[PDB]
Write a protein that binds this DNA or RNA. Structure first.
Ligand SMILES: [Zn+2]
Length: 252
DNA sequence: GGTAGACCTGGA
DNA sequence: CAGGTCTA
């Protein structure tokens, strides 16, 4: 899921779990658990803790318990559901948090690609994977100034810059491509080649793109099809080791 | 400073 | 491959 989707998950999941106390934690694919290293320690520590909050950082969900925070990343196909312990688990369910009221928080992921880290709450923010995470794209902490500072100091393409989690939190392939189209900037442009005007425009479109979604695509996945703004066929190449979609007329 | 190995599997 | 974010 994308940042706006994760924000939706955060908003909807919270009332379904807040105030519930963990009685058990069941793990069917240990590799999802990244900290503590031992999935049995991960399970043991959460037992007895009550869910107090749910926050989001980039595409990470941060479950706040009594003493610990649980940091979760769904990647592209991970999903959470709250349901009765009395009903059969859905396919590809890898982690289940059982509450004292007979309900469960279930983590499902066909790709088995998601990750979970648990730390003492006061430590979460200075440990992986949240450590070094850039500012929220919708926050004043993410400004044209910050973006310009990173752009000038690098020799990478502008797309690689925006894909860097330390520059800005949770900006993935789709929104990078969409934002660059809307900014009129070729993805393969060196970041340092961007004028001050291009940086300002890019920041504005980044915020608008992500901001509108949290509340139709121009280029992503539309290769071979006419540009919605000029009718030129959208093209697809590889930039920063990724599938990259752009209009060779609208973007320069 | 980077780029790239690692993780996973359904469908090209 | 298609995805993202970590560790090497
Ligand atoms: Zn166009």
């Amino acid at each position: 899921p994308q940042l706006p989707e994760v924000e939706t998950i955060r908003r909807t999941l919270l009332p379904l779990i807040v105030g519930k106390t963990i009685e058990d934690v069941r793990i069917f694919w240990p590799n999802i658990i990244r900290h503590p290293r031992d999935s049995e320690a991960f399970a043991a520590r959460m037992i007895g803790q009550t869910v107090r909050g749910l926050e989001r950082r980039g595409k990470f969900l941060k479950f706040l318990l009594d003493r610990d925070a649980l940091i979760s990343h769904l990647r592209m196909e991970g999903r959470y559901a709250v349901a009765s312990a009395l009903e059969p688990l859905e396919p590809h369910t890898h982690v289940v948090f059982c509450f004292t009221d007979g309900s469960e928080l279930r983590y499902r992921d066909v790709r088995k690609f998601g990750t979970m880290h648990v730390y003492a709450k006061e430590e979460a923010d200075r440990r992986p994977p949240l450590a070094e995470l850039g500012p929220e794209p919708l926050s004043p902490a993410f400004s044209p100034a910050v973006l310009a500072e990173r752009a000038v100091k690098t020799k990478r393409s502008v797309k690689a810059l925006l894909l860097d989690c330390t520059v800005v939190a949770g900006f993935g392939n789709i929104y990078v491509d969409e934002s660059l189209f809307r900014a009129g900037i070729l993805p393969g442009r060196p970041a340092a080649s961007l004028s001050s005007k291009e940086i300002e425009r890019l920041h504005e479109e980044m915020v608008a793109t992500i901001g509108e979604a949290v509340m139709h695509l121009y280029v992503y996945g539309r290769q071979g099809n006419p540009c919605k703004r000029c009718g030129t066929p959208i093209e697809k190449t590889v930039v920063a080791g990724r599938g990259t979609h752009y209009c060779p007329r609208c973007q320069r």
